[PDB]
């Protein structure tokens, strides 16, 4: 593993500057001095296949423009394209292109690191299990991951046991999980984009994070999976078309149903102003999530909008603001009274109002109307507990529909 003191330095003045001319630099490389390696538009570091293309082991290193190919395959030795050691604080990895069967950027407990504007690609030859993560973060703090494209590398970007992170603008495509995210307290995710994944946002076992402004496109099996996520400010998200596990001649009877929001055990959040659309289910609520504040959301075109299971009563309407509730059947007689009927969810009517969209007309007839008036007075179908006292007739989240 020769160092960057080898090859062609062409040093600019200031000594915190080492340019890099074009060419086929073949092998691995280790950074052991404070450097700012800024290279020309096209230079290629071709690691034949043995891993550890760049081992940054010194503080204050800034790598810009580099292109990396086929760095490694062995996950056991966590071979990556960039492997920032814990003592390489304040490192910056900007505007690099990386295509290899393994980790793209790996920060191992090094604080105040900046991974900006990197397009990471992975080969499709290897199976999804052995592709290797992208932008893996361990015990990191103060870091900022902005506008990094990662494609075809399992688990999108991964955060573990980290507190000081600020995430923005990531365009994650064709990965197993959009953001795999475990035991990461007091973080922040903004304006992320996950497409064609198998879990758009895995918000696991964490605390006091902000997931404002994110955006999940045609994902699969999950849109926003939240486990034990407390004291958070979930806002601004957009989840669309979370397809199920349907490949080949099979049917996962009573399973595999996609979910826009899988909210689990998360007692305290501030979920508001989110758009969940064209899903196979929304706001799946299990365990205990009392004291959570849900308002101003939008659920359109869902096969079943909610699957509340707890035996307690919880109103998702803080300060007279509910959710758009496409299934909501009629009734906005005061001009702005948000609604008179509380949206008591029925799973069966949700299925009808999605497959047959004209049934709303059929259920606005005065006869069916008085029947419903008698079915909201003498309960028929035991109350799935959720009930929005003040549902919404106008459709909010219009700003974030298409952006």
């Amino acid at each position: 593993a020769p160092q960057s003191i080898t090859t062609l330095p062409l040093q600019p003045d200031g000594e915190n500057r080492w340019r890099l001319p074009a060419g086929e630099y073949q092998g691995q490389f280790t950074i052991e001095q404070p450097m700012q390696l800024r290279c020309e538009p096209g230079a290629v570091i071709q690691s034949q296949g043995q891993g550890s293309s760049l081992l940054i082991s010194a503080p204050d290193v800034l790598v810009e423009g580099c292109t990396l190919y086929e760095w490694g395959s062995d996950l056991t030795a966590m071979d990556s394209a960039v492997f920032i050691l814990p003592a390489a604080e304040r490192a910056q990895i900007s505007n690099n292109r990386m295509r290899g069967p393994g980790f793209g950027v790996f920060v191992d407990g090094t604080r105040d690191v900046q991974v900006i504007g990197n397009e990471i690609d992975g080969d499709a030859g290897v199976r999804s299990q052995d592709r290797g993560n992208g932008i893996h973060l361990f015990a990191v703090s103060g870091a900022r991951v902005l506008h990094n494209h990662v494609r075809n590398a399992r688990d999108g970007i991964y955060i573990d046991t980290s507190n000081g992170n600020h995430l923005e603008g990531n365009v994650i495509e064709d990965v197993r999980y959009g953001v795999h995210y475990m035991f990461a307290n007091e973080n922040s995710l903004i304006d992320n984009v996950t497409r064609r994944t198998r879990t758009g946002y895995a918000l696991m076992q964490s605390r006091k994070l902000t997931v404002t402004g994110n955006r999940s496109e045609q994902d699969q099996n999950y849109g926003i999976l939240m486990n034990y996520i407390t004291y958070s400010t979930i806002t601004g998200n957009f989840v669309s078309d979370v397809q199920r596990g349907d490949t080949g001649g099979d049917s996962m009877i009573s399973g595999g149903e996609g979910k826009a929001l899988f909210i689990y055990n998360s007692l305290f959040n501030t979920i508001e102003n989110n758009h969940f659309e064209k899903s196979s289910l929304g706001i799946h609520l299990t365990a205990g999530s009392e004291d959570n504040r849900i308002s101003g959301n939008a659920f359109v075109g869902n096969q079943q909008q909610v699957k509340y299971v707890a035996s307690r009563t919880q109103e998702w309407s803080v300060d007279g603001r509910g959710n758009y509730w496409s299934d909501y059947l009629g009734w906005d007689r005061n001009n702005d009274g948000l609604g008179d009927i509380a949206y008591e969810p029925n799973d069966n009517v949700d299925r009808l109002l999605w497959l047959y969209p004209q049934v709303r007309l059929l259920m606005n007839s005065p006869s069916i109307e008085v029947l419903r008036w008698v079915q909201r007075a003498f309960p028929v179908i035991k109350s799935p507990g959720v009930q929005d006292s003040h549902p919404l007739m106008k459709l909010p989240t219009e700003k974030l529909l298409t952006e």
Partner: protein
Amino acid sequence: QKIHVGPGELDDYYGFWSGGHQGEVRVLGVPSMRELMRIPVFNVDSATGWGLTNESRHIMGDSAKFLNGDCHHPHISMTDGKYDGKYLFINDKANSRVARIRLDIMKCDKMITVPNVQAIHGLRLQKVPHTKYVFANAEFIIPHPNDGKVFDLQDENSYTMYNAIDAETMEMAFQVIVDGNLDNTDADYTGRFAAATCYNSEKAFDLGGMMRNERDWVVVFDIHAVEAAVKAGDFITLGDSKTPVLDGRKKDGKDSKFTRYVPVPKNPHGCNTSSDGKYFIAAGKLSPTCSMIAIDKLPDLFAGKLADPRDVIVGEPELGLGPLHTTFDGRGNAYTTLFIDSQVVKWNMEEAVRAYKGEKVNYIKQKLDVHYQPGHLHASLCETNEADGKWLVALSKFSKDRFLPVGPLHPENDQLIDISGDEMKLVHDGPTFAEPHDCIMARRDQIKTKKIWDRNDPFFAPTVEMAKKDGINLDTDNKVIRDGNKVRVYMTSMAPAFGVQEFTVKQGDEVTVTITNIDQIEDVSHGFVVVNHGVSMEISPQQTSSITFVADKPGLHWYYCSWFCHALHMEMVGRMMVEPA
């Protein structure tokens, strides 16, 4: 099926849930799922006198000083890969103990404190040719020797060992030094390769460090090589225990003759053997994947005729978030709990392998929303090569609101899932206290039982030997023996009276009451409780048991029977007179 065992109808399976952190063992009737019996193992049970009766303390040894236990995995001894109902082995992580319960008396007979290790978590039984060795895992790394000299955990002498105890004699057979720490263990159906998951490969004491490495290995032990080494005598020893200790630690990249390391991501928790015995399946708590090792490929791996350690992985199914345990239904399928996803996902081993080779197949048959946070899950007769797949029990660790509010502490939820057909469906939700962490199920025709004790049982043999020493025929003698300050009262008991209804002792005497229940009737069980002296026992038919206690309170004291012997139990009583010094 039959979701209800009503009055008159009998239950179909014995289910040996553990007592979890309480320490006991709970015998339930599947599918009725009600408490048939509570076998005290580690806790001091006032009911049967466990921990207070002399025979129980003798079984404990020097562990009697300890009032707590933490039992995780119960298992039943296997003959020819099938349950025989002879012994039941359970572990104790809190105090690093292994206990043996005779299943024909439903009481623990043996109890060994494994030396020079801490936190015995993993525990499983050899399946072929019989339960000859029982394998245990020490979850926490300690220095050796642990004399307080060096507290560093990264030293060469900081390690854990794969304990292996002889099943019959309950004397430790061998110990194998391994890198990292072992969480769960399992054995194959060849009797040769036993494997255990290693999750702290990182070797970090701190919080986050244990997840540094992307892949943490599943060690595999060649038991035949270990036996050959033990016979050859090239085994080291530690401390005051002559237990053979072997070395499976790596040495500058040279794999040991005893152990082979197979990388698995990430932090694996579970490890099981296929019903046919073909695939080791190891969970991955933090990876969304399960490793699938061809057991038939292990011989070549140890021989040194095989390439990279992972080549032995013949499948890596992707199931979901937080796979923890894998229970088999003998029909070619597997059932795994998705912890973070909070589900139980069906899949097909062979379809998973075919997918791993490239062919597109959806090996994921079904997902069932268990409620909530499942841990281990167990299908009936899964550990046998005779799995029937008629029931599943999944043990969710939080109940949240699924039951009545019982205060700040909540019971865990064991859920019964009919799996006889092709569709998994919940049947019964049961609250359980003290967090059972695993269970085992056996058929009603597999566990033979004894209604009445046999007078030559080794359980209470020390008491009978002490009786021969004093020339007392326990069967038909009621007498008081006074030697020094030690008073020993030998009585028979038959409802509704006690054989000795009085005996005067001097203050401070170590009184030792021995009671024999000669009644030959079934279920007529007596008790013996001394008021204000902390003395309680149960005396089952044909069983003789003794307790010792200091009579430090002068005056008249009354002792009653506790179990209800006959209509006039409130009448069976006695006066233990203590005279001041």
